Write an enzyme that holds these catalytic residues in place. Structure first.
Site, PDB file in Angstrom:
ATOM      1  N   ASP A   7       0.831  -1.193   0.000  1.00  0.00           N
ATOM      2  CA  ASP A   7       0.000   0.000   0.000  1.00  0.00           C
ATOM      3  C   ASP A   7       0.882   1.267   0.000  1.00  0.00           C
ATOM      4  OD1 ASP A   7      -1.724   1.967   0.472  1.00  0.00           O
ATOM      5  OD2 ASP A   7      -2.987   0.921   1.932  1.00  0.00           O
ATOM      6  N   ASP A 105      -3.084   2.386  -5.800  1.00  0.00           N
ATOM      7  CA  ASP A 105      -1.945   2.315  -4.892  1.00  0.00           C
ATOM      8  C   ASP A 105      -1.970   1.127  -3.945  1.00  0.00           C
ATOM      9  OD1 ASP A 105      -3.979   3.186  -3.054  1.00  0.00           O
ATOM     10  OD2 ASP A 105      -2.347   4.005  -1.821  1.00  0.00           O
ATOM     11  N   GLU A 106      -2.714   0.090  -4.318  1.00  0.00           N
ATOM     12  CA  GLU A 106      -2.854  -1.135  -3.527  1.00  0.00           C
ATOM     13  C   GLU A 106      -2.628  -2.345  -4.422  1.00  0.00           C
ATOM     14  OE1 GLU A 106      -6.634   0.349  -1.999  1.00  0.00           O
ATOM     15  OE2 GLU A 106      -6.533  -1.226  -0.479  1.00  0.00           O
TER      16      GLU A 106
HETATM   17  N1  LIG Z   1     -12.107  11.061  -1.417  1.00  0.00           N
HETATM   18  C1  LIG Z   1     -11.134  10.902  -2.334  1.00  0.00           C
HETATM   19  N2  LIG Z   1     -11.153  11.626  -3.494  1.00  0.00           N
HETATM   20  C2  LIG Z   1     -10.163  11.449  -4.396  1.00  0.00           C
HETATM   21  N3  LIG Z   1      -9.106  10.626  -4.317  1.00  0.00           N
HETATM   22  C3  LIG Z   1      -9.122   9.924  -3.153  1.00  0.00           C
HETATM   23  C4  LIG Z   1     -10.074   9.995  -2.138  1.00  0.00           C
HETATM   24  N4  LIG Z   1      -9.797   9.149  -1.100  1.00  0.00           N
HETATM   25  C5  LIG Z   1      -8.712   8.587  -1.471  1.00  0.00           C
HETATM   26  N5  LIG Z   1      -8.216   9.000  -2.710  1.00  0.00           N
HETATM   27  C6  LIG Z   1      -6.978   8.438  -3.201  1.00  0.00           C
HETATM   28  C7  LIG Z   1      -6.054   8.929  -2.057  1.00  0.00           C
HETATM   29  C8  LIG Z   1      -4.799   8.200  -2.238  1.00  0.00           C
HETATM   30  O1  LIG Z   1      -3.758   8.931  -2.902  1.00  0.00           O
HETATM   31  C9  LIG Z   1      -5.309   6.944  -2.949  1.00  0.00           C
HETATM   32  C10 LIG Z   1      -5.813   6.015  -1.821  1.00  0.00           C
HETATM   33  O2  LIG Z   1      -5.022   5.477  -0.804  1.00  0.00           O
HETATM   34  P1  LIG Z   1      -5.671   5.749   0.731  1.00  0.00           P
HETATM   35  O3  LIG Z   1      -6.558   6.779   0.144  1.00  0.00           O
HETATM   36  O4  LIG Z   1      -5.995   4.319   0.793  1.00  0.00           O
HETATM   37  O5  LIG Z   1      -4.251   6.125   1.075  1.00  0.00           O
HETATM   38  P2  LIG Z   1      -3.375   7.485   1.129  1.00  0.00           P
HETATM   39  O6  LIG Z   1      -2.187   7.029   0.350  1.00  0.00           O
HETATM   40  O7  LIG Z   1      -3.870   8.790   0.746  1.00  0.00           O
HETATM   41  O8  LIG Z   1      -3.182   7.244   2.697  1.00  0.00           O
HETATM   42  P3  LIG Z   1      -2.028   6.540   3.537  1.00  0.00           P
HETATM   43  O9  LIG Z   1      -1.165   7.619   4.361  1.00  0.00           O
HETATM   44  O10 LIG Z   1      -2.545   5.421   4.346  1.00  0.00           O
HETATM   45  O11 LIG Z   1      -0.944   5.972   2.562  1.00  0.00           O
HETATM   46  O12 LIG Z   1      -6.746   7.039  -3.323  1.00  0.00           O
HETATM   47 CA   LIG Z   2      -2.401   4.253   0.626  1.00  0.00          CA
HETATM   48 CA   LIG Z   3      -4.751   2.152  -0.312  1.00  0.00          CA
END
Ligand SMILES: Nc1ncnc2c1ncn2[C@H]1C[C@H](O)[C@@H](COP(=O)(O)OP(=O)(O)OP(=O)(O)O)O1
Ligand SMILES: [Ca+2]
Ligand SMILES: [Ca+2]
Ligand SMILES: [Ca+2]
EC number: 2.7.7.7
Length: 341
Positions: A7, A105-106
């Site tokens: 992730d 990203d997963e």
């Molecule tokens: N509400 C949203 N609108 C648009 N893009 C989004 C939204 N929520 C998530 N994304 C994107 C955000 C991230 O860059 C990607 C998702 O990963 P998550 O959102 O699972 O992790 P993140 O990378 O932002 O958090 P982490 O710190 O856990 O790595 O999907």
């Molecule tokens: Ca993430």
């Molecule tokens: Ca993720």
DNA sequence: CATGGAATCCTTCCCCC
DNA sequence: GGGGGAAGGATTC
């Protein structure tokens, strides 16, 4: 059966840091501007510097600014992130033939062959994190366990920039200790339904008649939770194939005027077609987000593929059907193509 | 104030042996 | 009674 889940950390924001290192260390907010009014829109994601203060994915840009008026606000560049993501997936591929790209990203890797135990799995984890940080300069979190679900739970506990193995011993203690809500596939709505039935931990799903569970959250979701609670869940890692492509945009002002809407609609169709690229859909759905944030949709499946002219034509009839059957104004309008030949 | 893509599952028809 | 599908919506990541 050993599954390794990867992730990428605060991905969109971390990519912006990689492309402009001077951002590193500062609060970074990647946003999606809806163009309705000054800073209208939501936050796609933010780095940890920003999250420690309450700025995160989903809150209105306007609210993030009241908290971190001096942070760096950037417009989302999905395309650039997608390409960086692809390069990373290709790195992981060299670690397993069996790989499931779940999102931008997963990804899950079935390393049942490559490795012989958790120690060798862990070491493979570190090797992957390091390889990705060296090649792309992007930090990721690795989760390792018996199946996909626990692999993911593993990562969630270890983020950011972590790695963690959940051995069969902890799997059992989690089935008893883990809050049902922290289980993937359990959102707010399902978590609540489960609270009412008195199920707060996975195990609780055994002290309930199956049919009552099925009635409350559905059979599929019922069988899912039960197989996990009984330590018998095991879905294989498979490459998923795109099944639909669509795009939805936001209008500057809510409307009900067909001529005022068409432009945004055709614009969505155009973008959707450019993305279909060689792919021919037999189905089309017009999606509208009502002024009160409700989602309505009207569609039609054809006995053959849909040409762009047919799409333009058919989408307007569906939008009209929507306006006819729903009196509310429309806030967001769009389309989705599916059932590829 | 509240963007955005897409999968999968749930209901309610509907056609038909 | 149930296979086979299509629609519209619910829910989640
Ligand atoms: N509400 C949203 N609108 C648009 N893009 C989004 C939204 N929520 C998530 N994304 C994107 C955000 C991230 O860059 C990607 C998702 O990963 P998550 O959102 O699972 O992790 P993140 O990378 O932002 O958090 P982490 O710190 O856990 O790595 O999907
Ligand atoms: Ca993430
Ligand atoms: Ca993720
Ligand atoms: Ca949850």
């Amino acid at each position: 059966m050993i599954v390794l889940f990867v992730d990428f950390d605060y991905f969109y924001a971390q990519v912006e840091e990689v492309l402009n290192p001077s951002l590193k260390g500062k609060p970074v907010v990647v946003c999606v501007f809806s163009g309705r009014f000054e800073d209208s829109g939501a936050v796609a994601t933010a780095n940890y510097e920003a999250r420690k203060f309450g700025v995160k994915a989903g809150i209105p840009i306007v609210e993030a600014k009241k908290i971190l008026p001096n942070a760096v606000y950037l417009p989302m560049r999905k395309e650039v992130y997608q390409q960086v993501s692809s390069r990373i997936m290709n790195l992981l591929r060299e670690y397993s033939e069996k790989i499931e790209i779940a999102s931008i990203d997963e990804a899950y890797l079935d390393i049942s062959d490559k490795v012989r135990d958790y120690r060798e799995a862990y070491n493979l984890g570190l090797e992957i994190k390091n390889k990705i940080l060296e090649k792309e300069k992007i930090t990721v979190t690795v989760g390792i366990s018996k199946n996909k679900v626990f692999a993911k739970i593993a990562a969630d506990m270890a983020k950011p920039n972590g790695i963690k193995v959940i051995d069969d011993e902890e799997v059992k203690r989690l089935i008893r200790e883990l809050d049902i809500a922290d289980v993937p596939g359990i959102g707010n709505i399902t978590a609540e339904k489960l609270k009412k039935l008195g199920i707060n931990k996975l195990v609780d799903t055994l002290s309930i008649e199956f049919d009552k569970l099925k009635g409350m959250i559905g059979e599929a979701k019922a069988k899912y939770l039960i197989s996990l609670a009984r330590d018998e869940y095991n879905e294989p890692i498979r490459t998923r194939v795109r099944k639909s492509i669509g795009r939805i945009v936001t209008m500057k002002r809510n409307s009900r005027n067909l001529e005022e809407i068409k432009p945004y609609l055709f614009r969505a169709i155009e973008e959707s077609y450019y993305k279909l690229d060689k792919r021919i859909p037999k189905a089309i759905h017009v999606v509208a987000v009502t002024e009160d944030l409700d989602i309505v949709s009207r569609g039609r499946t054809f006995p053959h593929g849909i040409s762009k002219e047919t799409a333009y034509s058919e989408s307007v009839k569906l939008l009209q059907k929507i306006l006819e059957e729903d009196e509310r104004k429309i806030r967001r309008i769009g389309v989705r193509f599916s059932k590829f030949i």
